[PDB]
Amino acid sequence: PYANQPTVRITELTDENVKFIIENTDLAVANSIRRVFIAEVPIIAIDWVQIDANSSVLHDEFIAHRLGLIPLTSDDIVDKLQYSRDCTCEEFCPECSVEFTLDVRCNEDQTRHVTSRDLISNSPRVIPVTSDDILIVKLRKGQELRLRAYAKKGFGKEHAKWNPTAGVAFEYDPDNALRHTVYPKPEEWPKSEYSELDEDESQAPYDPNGKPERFYYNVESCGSLRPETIVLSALSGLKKKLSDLQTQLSHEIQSDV
Amino acid sequence: MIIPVRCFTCGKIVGNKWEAYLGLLQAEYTEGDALDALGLKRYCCRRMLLAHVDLIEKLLNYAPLEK
Amino acid sequence: SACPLRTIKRVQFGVLSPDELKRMSVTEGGIKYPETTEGGRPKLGGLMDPRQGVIERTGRCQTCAGNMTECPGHFGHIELAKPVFHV
Amino acid sequence: DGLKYSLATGNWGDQKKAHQARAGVSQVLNRLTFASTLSHLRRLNSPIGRDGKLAKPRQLHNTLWGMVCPAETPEGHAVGLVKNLALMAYISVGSQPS
Amino acid sequence: QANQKRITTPYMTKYERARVLGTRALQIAMCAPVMVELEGETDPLLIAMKELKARKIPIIIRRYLPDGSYEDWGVDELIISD
Amino acid sequence: MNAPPAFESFLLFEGEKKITINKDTKVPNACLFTINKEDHTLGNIIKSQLLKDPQVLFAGYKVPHPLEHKIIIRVQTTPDYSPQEAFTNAITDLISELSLLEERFRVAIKDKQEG
Amino acid sequence: TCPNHPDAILVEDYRAGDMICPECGLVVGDRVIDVGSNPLLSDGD
Amino acid sequence: FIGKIPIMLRSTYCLLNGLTDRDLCELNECPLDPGGYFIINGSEKVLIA
Amino acid sequence: SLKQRLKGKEGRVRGNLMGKRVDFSARTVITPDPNLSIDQVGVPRSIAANMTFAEIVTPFNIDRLQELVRRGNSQYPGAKYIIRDNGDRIDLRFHPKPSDLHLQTGYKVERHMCDGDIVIFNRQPTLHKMSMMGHRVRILPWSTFRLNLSVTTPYNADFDGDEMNLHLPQSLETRAEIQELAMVPRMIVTPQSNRPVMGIVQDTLTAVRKFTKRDVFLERGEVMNLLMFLSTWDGKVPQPAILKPRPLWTGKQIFSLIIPGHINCIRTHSTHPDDEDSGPYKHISPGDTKVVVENGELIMGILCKKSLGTSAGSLVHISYLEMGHDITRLFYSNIQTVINNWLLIEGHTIGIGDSIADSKTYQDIQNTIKKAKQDVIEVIEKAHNNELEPTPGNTLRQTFENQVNRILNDARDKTGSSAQKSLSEYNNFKSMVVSGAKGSKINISQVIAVVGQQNVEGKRIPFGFKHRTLPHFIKDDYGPESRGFVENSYLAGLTPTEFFFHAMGGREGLIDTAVKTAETGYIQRRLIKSMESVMVKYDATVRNSINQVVQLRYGEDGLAGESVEFQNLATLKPSN
Amino acid sequence: YRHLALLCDTMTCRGHLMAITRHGVNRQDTGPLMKCSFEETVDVLMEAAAHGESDPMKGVSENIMLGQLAPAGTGCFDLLLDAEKCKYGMEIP
Amino acid sequence: IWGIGCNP
Amino acid sequence: MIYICGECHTENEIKSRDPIRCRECGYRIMYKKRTKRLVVFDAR
Amino acid sequence: EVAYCSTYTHCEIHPSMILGVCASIIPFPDHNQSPRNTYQSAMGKQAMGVYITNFHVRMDTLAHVLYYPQKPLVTTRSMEYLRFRELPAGINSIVAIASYTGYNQEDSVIMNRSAVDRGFFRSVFYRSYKEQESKKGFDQEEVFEKPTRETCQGMRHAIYDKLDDDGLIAPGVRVSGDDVIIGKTVTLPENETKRDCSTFLRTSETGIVDQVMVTLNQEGYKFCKIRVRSVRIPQIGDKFASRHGQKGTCGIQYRQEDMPFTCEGITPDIIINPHAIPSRMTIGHLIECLQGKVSANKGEIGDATPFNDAVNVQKISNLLSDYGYHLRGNEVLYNGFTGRKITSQIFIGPTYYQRLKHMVDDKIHSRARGPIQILNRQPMEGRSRDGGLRFGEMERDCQIAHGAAQFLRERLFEASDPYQVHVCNLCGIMAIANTRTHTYECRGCRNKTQISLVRMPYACKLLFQELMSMSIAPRMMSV
RNA sequence: UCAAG
Ligand SMILES: CO[C@@H]1[C@H](O)[C@H](n2cnc3c(=O)nc(N)[nH]c32)O[C@H]1COP(=O)(O)OP(=O)(O)OP(=O)(O)O
Ligand SMILES: [Mg+2]
Ligand SMILES: [Zn+2]
Ligand SMILES: [Zn+2]
Ligand SMILES: [Zn+2]
Ligand SMILES: [Zn+2]
Ligand SMILES: [Zn+2]
Ligand SMILES: [Zn+2]
């Protein structure tokens, strides 16, 4: 009646990708970790825009949306930052937000490409993943865009702008042995990259005793967080959710009795 | 009208890759080769760059409302 | 309001008597004036008679204090010089 | 004023006389999509009344091969009574017979 | 009619049940006394349903025969259609 | 116009209890836990860990409606065991598993880099 | 003309179409907006 | 002077006839606009055949 | 003119008296919601806030209504107005004096519509009585009306832009009328055909067929999750059908818990072999057909449209006839919830792999078409030689068309049968056709084998040009391709001429739909007007308004149409 | 069969085949307002006025027009209060 | 679209 | 009360009940300038 | 060949040219059922996209422009001449044909909420309001100015703070429903000061002013056009359709975590019910998904000309087999909620989906004690006028069949047009009645005692009075 | 007049 002891092997580790294999774990835990990658890893992204002048062809809310989708480096400052709801100060302060300011005007005849590099942050740690560049808008001569934006901490359950990952690849039982998916014609299906079978055999023989284990992961990052940091923060955040549940449950249990 | 940041299906930033894609096409790369070189691997991401129509240049052809 | 509430149990249909039309109509002497406006707005003995119905959503018709809701309207009569077949 | 009135109202005739006027001509151009604009410009309207439910004018005819789109017709009370030209179809402008 | 020689159905019709429950509920909403003890029931319609189950609704149904006569069946006398 | 705000999915509004424990009258030693402002993430882990316990006879989770944000978890335990005890022990076990996984993932990171 | 408020300006309303006393909210006039409903050329014809 | 005839857009007698796409842009008219419609009383009307 | 005003539709007589625009009514797009019960409807919050139901203040409910008054219009569970004893209406939006907010018995607070408020739900056209049913209100946080999928069949509504009308009764008397006469559970069975109106539909039907197969075995946790969505569960886990080696429940075992009470029913699956009943294995059915439910437990059988659909003797019909309307409502909802949560584990799909068939089957279809074209050629040559003999009562042209159509139809059906033989068990077209959720054998045949003959006005494609169908064909060509036979399937793709002929056939279908709507509407209105006042009097005679006796007893036996059932006399047929 | 038989009985009740049309339905001696709701309208009203016809007000449509409770179901009977039963029982409020 | 006895 | 001009894009202040004509171009199609008050846009 | 015709005199340039403009955008038209091509021809006219490149200059009522139009991945050759690539209307979407949660049943569609957040099928709605300062009246002048409650005897309690001095709201100001876009005042002749003549925003527009223009119209009076912009994020009521006649609303929106995911991590943007395909027989949709997968992997836009004979399903399947996927396009999916593999393999591929103009926000209406008509004193008609829904004659027949006489009475009398009249007992004709004076008298009888109150719909009173004006006497007698 | 069922 106790938790299984999981293990991890990291097959690949790059700047934008982490491949790891979690073994001796339940399927529910592995899928929940995959889910927390997507929806519950906090990141800093723009959520407040005040546009002073917008002569571009794109309307103001278009520019606001594009700005929000721009990833911002949140490697270490996101843990320090507090949610805007938690902060005592009214609206936004340096402890609860990061201020970005953008001023661009096209006076040259050539079209001016407003890029993420033109976004200027008051805090050095949070930068728009620049150290090409994301194109916010293109400006004709005589067109000007000036705006002021504040970035808040949040996770992807609120909005996809706070989604740390690009694509989380989750796969278990690479050669179908628990028969969780029943192929009508086993031969036609392409073999998995993790499959251990020889070319002749399409599926592994059915194992009734076996249960899902040795889950394979591939986490890719947008550059907002280090791909290792996404996994570590997801594990820590899920642990925090469970601990909060335990505290509230203890309160209810004691109060009822 | 303009290349979308963050490919819809997965979320990979694809807004920085439009000008590079056009330049690779000018370099006589095939569209598939350009997509491979840019690092777009999943067909969801390749859809974004391959099927994008850049209307913002046509919109920029018009003179500005205020000079 | 003092009148008791009743539900119609029989509807009797008949041709209106000309004498009954004369008695029932609030307008007396008929509609003598084609114009609807006299004294500026109201034309007595005209098409828009204050006694016939409430006008302008704020006035009260002469016959009753309708206030544009209570008054059901009141009929008027035109005395044709020579009789005309009803179609 | 005569030309402007007939275009604006959609009634083909004079202002005083609407008895011989034909309604339904000169509709406002649809600008929901470029396809809608193009199809509105290339449109045919059969004069048969919509109220009549006789089905002969509505059915697709063999002679509409290549002249009128077989698929594009409004569905409802005007099935087959409004038609769209095919892509290559060209209506004749007219010439003298001399 | 006389109380004897009642020819209508002993069972309460569905329309009678609907109108009796609605009318009794409207009366209960207007602070009419409730025959049945309520077990924390505040909605008037539910209290009317409880009364109907207990057959304590103080309404007598007058059923008009097509010949013009009427037969007065009390709600208690009628067998509930349920 | 009737769209709910995005923060409503995870933020408890004032006066809302994260966990409410209501016993089940139908069967002995069964309790029905209602978790507010939570989704399949927490529910599936808790149900799985409960199912691993030999003394837990029944364990399941249900989202009553996807548009609303609530989890209902039914736990039935054998006599000499309490459903609330099983819930607490499940949470402790999940926390232990996650902590061990964090330590081993950090070690793997350190080994992969410069090694 | 709110009966309890001598010389009270009644605010017009568009939702139900009535004039309402702003200090007490009494509806004076129930549905008295309804719909609420060339003079230059020639004259009356 | 005997009156005024409405002009269908981009026909031979319209101002937009024989104009390069840059010139159409300078007049704030789309190069891809098909034409074939009258602007009567400020609204574009199409004569259904 | 006065006569013009009164006479026409939308005049005073009909457009303003028989029907009229009404207050307390709302309309918006409808979208699905499997989680809502049959009687529940999901109302948006704005619609719920605008619509108000006046509540009389009683000593019982004075506190609750006082809280609602305090909340006001802005907060959603609030009160828009207060109606005093004098009839004075205090709009709470504009500032009411704190004295005005105080409530006493007899005041009427107009609260916003809340969960559990009975409403009437309508979809035009209102063809039958089931098109207006009383629904309980559940407020959900989006701007579309949400109704359960089973309730779509009475309304004839699908969620492709449809809309429905919501009417809120404003009095306790009319609310009770709706509650006890027109609620959805009360109108499960129609008196028109003494069949249930509503049945399991779409994903739930397709998945109930798969769930009830002999193959389906469920492990412990899956059974836990499925039982979680069963509302009437006793809390006791059924003993697994396979105790060892590993405890494994069966789909029928779980569905038996859904079945209400103790219901006995015997039905046959769609694929039931005809010879099975006579031969051995009649009771131990080899194909797991012959659905039998004993003591409310599914002993055997694969559920399908026949067992759980809208037909006489269905499991739902027997539930309504035996258990009652409330338990049947729970039955519908529980089937949907449990089966839809199992479908997450199993899943359903449609792909090109379903349309494609084996190479041998394609060759067989091609050979059938080849020999059919040869037979049509032989008939044509016989007609040209005048060897053909006219069928009695028919001209030679008519009999030639008859014989050619017979040959083409036989080839079409044979190719369709070959395609249907090719289908595997895993084929999803076959899953949906066998379950009865959607599609037909004809659609499979057209998808895989042969689209078929295109007929317009009951004949092959006519000679629109002079003596030829299209300019591409030769004059006086009565062959199969020329006159409209589409040899290719949809998957294979139609040749251009076949595309045009197929367009002609589809146009005929569209025109028929458009015409039938109007003509049927007129017929229905005339029937209703002729028979509107006829009713069963307390003499149980059926009399009109004039009191003339139409029938001495209703239906000649004085019984209602919903309670009756099909039965066999069993004394009539046997010999002496 | 009940629904078919009822239509057949209404059409053949009078002894002459009554078509479900304006002619057959309106010729039957129903109330003038009920005839007015179906097709002919104003002409029916004019004829009824000429001959001094009286509307019995027993029809459903006639009662619907005047806003009264219809004689249909839930309107067939008239409920009366039972004083003796009101006295009996526990009058808690 | 099927045959003469079926549908168009 | 500053109107931008369509033809020459030069702001001209126009008083109430004054003809709508841009000085320096004569064009009669004016646009009102963007308001000074600022609107918060959620990037969402 | 085997001799059929040896006297051909002309040849077709290409058979696909029989189709028109709207039917030419359909990919693989020959693989669909004919009514479905007909339906797509109508649906394509209602799709959203950039209608014209000069849309910023144009001030049109009801203009919708999509944020990120994309050209089809599977396109017809004849689309190039239609300029569909230049001005596309729709977005290629990863579509899974599966039954996930039952919210895609019937024709509804499950959409990815994370994709919607990233800009998927987002649009802008521009509405233009025109007003003209008319001085044509002899003593009436409709001057543009900001109305003042004290100065103007006629006014409304909606917000007037937005209006500037000119009476026109400045661009960039948010406007909620029932706000004053334009303020206009008609000088009132003093027969013996001001009847308000402002224009008010359509309810629930909730937009930001984009452009405000002041000109002189054809008549020479001052003309003002105001364009209001409203972004429209897709909701669970909006209507989405493919190019193969499959239309449906959005059943529900699931986030990327909840949506089913492939092993690569690709989650469908749109999930459509498998039950739509078989009855409708739109196989062109399936072939378009297969060709779209092949095109996205290969990097070349797929060719879907109607009649090709060089493009077959088998060839597309082999091409897809080269790129590492199942040849028929099926993919193994994992359940988002639990992570278990779905036993059936779901058919996933990119498909061009369109967004139609019909949206739930424009189609939602609720009425409760609103304004009434003048002639009938019945509720108004239409969403703009806060009109109630009509309780038609078919509806009343249904209610009669129910036996719900009192609900029928409420709906047809009490909810719509309640009214009271006074009728003489001696003669059925209505009688004059002064409630305030408390004197009730009947003309023609010289009788005051015998008068009875009758409750009837106002429409019935109007009917009886119109009968009386035709000399018919509808004598309603209580006896 | 044009769409929505
Ligand atoms: C199924 O029947 C309905 C109803 O009868 C109602 N309805 C629709 N139009 C009318 C009309 O003009 N007049 C009247 N009286 N009723 C009307 O609509 C019918 C079907 O029409 P459709 O055949 O287009 O439905 P798809 O099969 O097309 O559904 P997809 O796959 O798009 O969701
Ligand atoms: Mg539909
Ligand atoms: Zn702060
Ligand atoms: Zn991607
Ligand atoms: Zn009066
Ligand atoms: Zn007051
Ligand atoms: Zn200028
Ligand atoms: Zn009198």
Side-chain angles (χ1 to χ4, degrees), chain I residues 504-523:
Chain I
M504 298 181 58
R507 177 71 62 86
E508 189 185 18
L510 265 50
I511 298 169
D512 288 5
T513 300
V515 169
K516 83 177 182 182
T517 58
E519 292 196 4
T520 56
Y522 192 40
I523 303 174

Side-chain angles (χ1 to χ4, degrees), chain I residues 3 6-7 13 17-18 177 181 191-192 522 525-527 529-533 535 538 542 545-546 548 550-551 554-557 559 561 564, chain J residues 1-3 5-7 9-10 13-14 20-21 25 29-30 34 36-39 41-42 58-61 64-65 71-72 74 76-77 93:
Chain I
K3 196 227 71 174
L6 305 176
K7 182 202 69 62
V13 173
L17 270 179
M18 307 308 292
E177 290 195 346
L181 294 171
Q192 166 191 339
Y522 192 40
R525 175 184 180 273
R526 298 155 82 189
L527 291 186
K529 296 306 292 183
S530 68
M531 289 186 297
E532 50 184 352
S533 57
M535 93 181 66
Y538 281 93
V542 198
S545 55
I546 313 169
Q548 306 172 359
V550 180
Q551 299 179 345
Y554 170 49
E556 301 167 350
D557 55 342
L559 307 172
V564 294
Chain J
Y1 167 81
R2 335 189 156 269
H3 309 299
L6 189 86
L7 175 66
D9 282 324
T10 56
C13 170
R14 194 70 56 153
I20 314 288
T21 65
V25 176
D29 289 356
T30 63
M34 170 169 292
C36 174
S37 65
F38 181 57
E39 303 219 13
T41 62
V42 185
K58 301 174 185 174
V60 183
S61 302
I64 256 56
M65 287 177 52
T74 64
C76 308
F77 50 95

Side-chain angles (χ1 to χ4, degrees), chain D residues 76, chain I residues 123 125 156 158 160 513 517, chain M residues 36 39 107 245-247 280:
Chain I
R123 179 193 178 272
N156 291 139
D158 44 333
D160 58 6
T513 300
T517 58
Chain M
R36 292 296 141 183
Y39 295 151
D107 292 82
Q246 306 282 352
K247 50 182 177 183
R280 298 170 172 81

Side-chain angles (χ1 to χ4, degrees), chain F residues 38-109:
Chain F
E38 291 291 345
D39 58 336
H40 301 265
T41 323
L42 240 40
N44 207 20
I45 334 172
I46 300 170
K47 176 192 74 64
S48 176
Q49 190 64 38
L50 285 166
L51 285 179
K52 297 179 60 176
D53 199 322
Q55 283 157 310
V56 172
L57 298 176
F58 184 93
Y61 84 103
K62 164 186 180 171
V63 279
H65 204 280
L67 290 178
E68 301 168 357
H69 314 287
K70 199 173 71 175
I71 312 180
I72 315 174
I73 300 188
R74 185 182 189 271
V75 190
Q76 176 186 355
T77 58
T78 64
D80 303 352
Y81 207 49
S82 181
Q84 301 114 7
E85 296 188 24
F87 211 86
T88 68
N89 293 8
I91 298 183
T92 71
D93 297 353
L94 298 176
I95 289 180
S96 301
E97 173 178 357
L98 289 175
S99 64
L100 196 52
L101 199 48
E102 295 188 31
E103 305 167 10
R104 303 190 175 176
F105 196 79
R106 285 172 189 163
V107 174
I109 285 174

Side-chain angles (χ1 to χ4, degrees), chain I residues 409 412 442-443 445-446 450-456 459 461 484-488 490 494 498-510, chain K, chain M residues 32-36 279-281:
Chain I
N409 288 0
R412 181 198 71 197
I442 297 173
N443 295 155
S445 161
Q446 301 187 203
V450 155
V451 171
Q453 171 71 45
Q454 314 295 136
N455 42 304
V456 171
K459 323 165 184 178
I461 294 297
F485 193 70
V486 181
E487 144 187 351
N488 299 270
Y490 287 119
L494 317 189
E498 299 175 5
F499 183 82
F500 198 83
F501 298 153
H502 190 60
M504 298 181 58
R507 177 71 62 86
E508 189 185 18
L510 265 50
Chain K
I1 41 201
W2 181 223
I4 303 171
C6 240
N7 56 7
Chain M
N32 292 321
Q33 201 197 4
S34 30
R36 292 296 141 183
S279 56
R280 298 170 172 81
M281 289 171 297

Side-chain angles (χ1 to χ4, degrees), chain C residues 26 50-53 60-65 71 74, chain M residues 432-434 443:
Chain C
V26 289
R51 58 177 80 96
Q52 181 155 34
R60 317 292 188 90
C61 66
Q62 295 182 339
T63 63
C64 62
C71 171
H74 318 275
Chain M
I432 311 175
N434 300 32
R443 294 184 182 267

